[PDB]
Each structure stands twice: as C-alpha cells, then as structure tokens.
Design a protein around this ligand. Sequence first.
Ligand SMILES: Nc1ncnc2c1ncn2[C@@H]1O[C@H](COP(=O)(O)OP(=O)(O)OC[C@H]2O[C@H](O)[C@H](O)[C@@H]2O)[C@@H](O)[C@H]1O
Length: 168
Amino acid sequence: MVNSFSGYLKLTDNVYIKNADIVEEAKKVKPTVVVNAANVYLKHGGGVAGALNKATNNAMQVESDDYIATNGPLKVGGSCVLSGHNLAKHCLHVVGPNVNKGEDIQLLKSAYENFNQHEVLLAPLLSAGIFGADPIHSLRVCVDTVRTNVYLAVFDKNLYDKLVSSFL
Ligand SMILES: Nc1ncnc2c1ncn2[C@@H]1O[C@H](COP(=O)(O)OP(=O)(O)OC[C@H]2O[C@H](O)[C@H](O)[C@@H]2O)[C@@H](O)[C@H]1O
C-alpha cells in the first residue's frame, strides 16, 4: 500500500518519526491501522487514547465498552483490533506496562510485538506518557522489536527534538 504519510524523518529501514498529533495524522492519512496506547480496561481517558476517542465523538469508547463486556480486559503487553471509525480502517489498541504502578518494563517489548501483525501502522510511543516509561527507552524498544513499517507521531516538540538526536 502507498499512503500519504509526509514529512517523516527516517530512523531505520522500517521506522519513521514526526513531530505531530496522531489524531491529525490519522485524519489526514486515514491509515489502515492507527495504534492506541491503551490500558487493559480500554478506558480512553487521556493522552493518545483520550484524544483519539474524542475525535471519534466517543464511538471508540462505546465500541470498547462492548468489547470488554464480551471479552474482559486485555493483558498487559496485549492488544485487540477494533474499528478506526472516522480516523483509520482499524485501531490496534495496545497495552504497554504501567511502570508507575509497578508493572514490568520488560512487557513493553511484548506490547510492540503486536505491531508485527500489521504491515503498516501509525503509532505513538507506548508507555512513554502517563505510564512512566523513559521515552527514549520506548523508542529503542520499538526500533529493536517492530519489523513492519511504523510511522511514529510524537506530539511533544521538546521530546521529539531530544529523541531524534539520541542514539538508538
Ligand atoms: N495526541 C497525541 N499524539 C501523539 N502523541 C501523543 C498524543 N498525546 C500524547 N502523546 C504522547 O504519546 C506517548 C504515550 O503517552 P500516553 O498516551 O499517556 O500513553 P501511555 O502508554 O504512557 O499510557 C497509557 C494511558 O494513557 C491514556 O490515558 C490511556 O487511556 C492509558 O490509560 C507520550 O510520549 C505522549 O507525549
């Protein structure tokens, strides 16, 4: 597939990065897969999840509530594929570890492995926000784990500028 992703810096053969709001990227590109940085309950309160959900006029949350009622919570490091609504064909909800609540940072690798089930993804840095993982570590795990084509949208300008001048 050829998508309209534009303005990305190349990190590796398969990883690209941009200082952009993932919601705006998704609206513009309408990718096959947008990744959400979820919790196990799919309660999309803030950060990427809250912003994606608001942009769907709460349809993502309503769908997620049905998913949980049927299937129960995700695993830490796990994922599910749901609709992307008005933003993308699909949303891959992926749960990084909540390091701030004692969950094992090693599960971040398991979380990123879910990306390998999709040829192309628009994604955030899992666990790097409210979940408290070091952002550069999340980027390095992404680079070292994901083999499919991943376009990373980093909202925060100061963070982006630091990440792109760090070794991988
Ligand atoms: N609109 C955005 N576009 C791109 N990146 C963003 C955006 N908003 C935040 N980031 C960055 O995206 C990165 C991830 O920040 P987070 O979204 O907190 O995800 P987590 O995995 O740490 O925490 C999961 C919880 O977050 C939610 O509350 C969920 O419901 C979960 O409970 C950071 O670098 C952010 O600067």
